[PDB]
């Protein structure tokens, strides 16, 4: 689905720069009042360097 | 595009009663504005921010107001108790609905 | 006029006008298929042919 993927680290993942998906993930990841805790994990993979 | 001299007369009529009026311009790039807050403020300070948005006034172009209400609600910065007033001279019945 | 997979978002809608939406959006992921298979040679797999 997606919930596990945020937790594994053997396969890296990413997306097309400055798509709407990239801004969507940047929006969900930083928000400390998100109820979920998947989105704020994924950002730490995508944003490397 | 608002010319804040038009509300120069709140000053001597709300500093007296001692309310806590604050201003803040709303950008064209809303998402940059919102994300900079999450990027820069402490999680202590930011919890004193949601304490203010429980009341507001909007004074703006309705086509901006729609997108701003949608971004504020969608990022969960407000809940079922807020009471946002809106004022304008012209709003037609298409936009009252939206 | 513009026409494609152009997802509606408030920061885009602020500067151009969108029709009613004609199909719903959804994020997904693509991944490579794995292996784990069984064959007549599985009897002999511990040694090279």
UniProtKB/Swiss-Prot annotation, chain B:
Changing residue 35 to N: In a colorectal cancer sample; somatic mutation. It is found in: Postsynaptic cell membrane. It comes from the Eukaryota. Belongs to the glutamate-gated ion channel (TC 1.A.10.1) family. GRID2 subfamily. It is linked to Spinocerebellar ataxia, autosomal recessive, 18: A form of spinocerebellar ataxia, a clinically and genetically heterogeneous group of cerebellar disorders. Patients show progressive incoordination of gait and often poor coordination of hands, speech and eye movements, due to degeneration of the cerebellum with variable involvement of the brainstem and spinal cord. SCAR18 features include progressive cerebellar atrophy, delayed psychomotor development, severely impaired gait, ocular movement abnormalities, and intellectual disability. Tetramer; dimer of dimers. Interacts with EML2, MAGI2 (via PDZ domains) and AP4M1. Interacts with BECN1, GOPC, GRID2IP, SHANK1 and SHANK2. Interacts with CBLN2, but not with CBLN4. Interacts with CBLN1 (via C1q domain); the interaction is CBLN1-NRX1 complex formation-dependent; CBLN1-binding is calcium-independent; CBLN1 hexamers anchor GRID2 N-terminal domain dimers to monomeric NRXN1 isoform beta; promotes synaptogenesis and mediates the D-Serine-dependent long term depression signals and AMPA receptor endocytosis. Member of the ionotropic glutamate receptor family, which plays a crucial role in synaptic organization and signal transduction in the central nervous system. Although it shares structural features with ionotropic glutamate receptors, does not bind glutamate as a primary ligand. Promotes synaptogenesis and mediates the D-Serine-dependent long term depression signals and AMPA receptor endocytosis of cerebellar parallel fiber-Purkinje cell (PF-PC) synapses through the NRX1B-CBLN1-GRID2 triad complex. The PDZ-binding motif mediates interaction with GOPC. This is Glutamate receptor ionotropic, delta-2. It comes from Homo sapiens. The lineage of its organism: Eukaryota, Metazoa, Chordata, Craniata, Vertebrata.
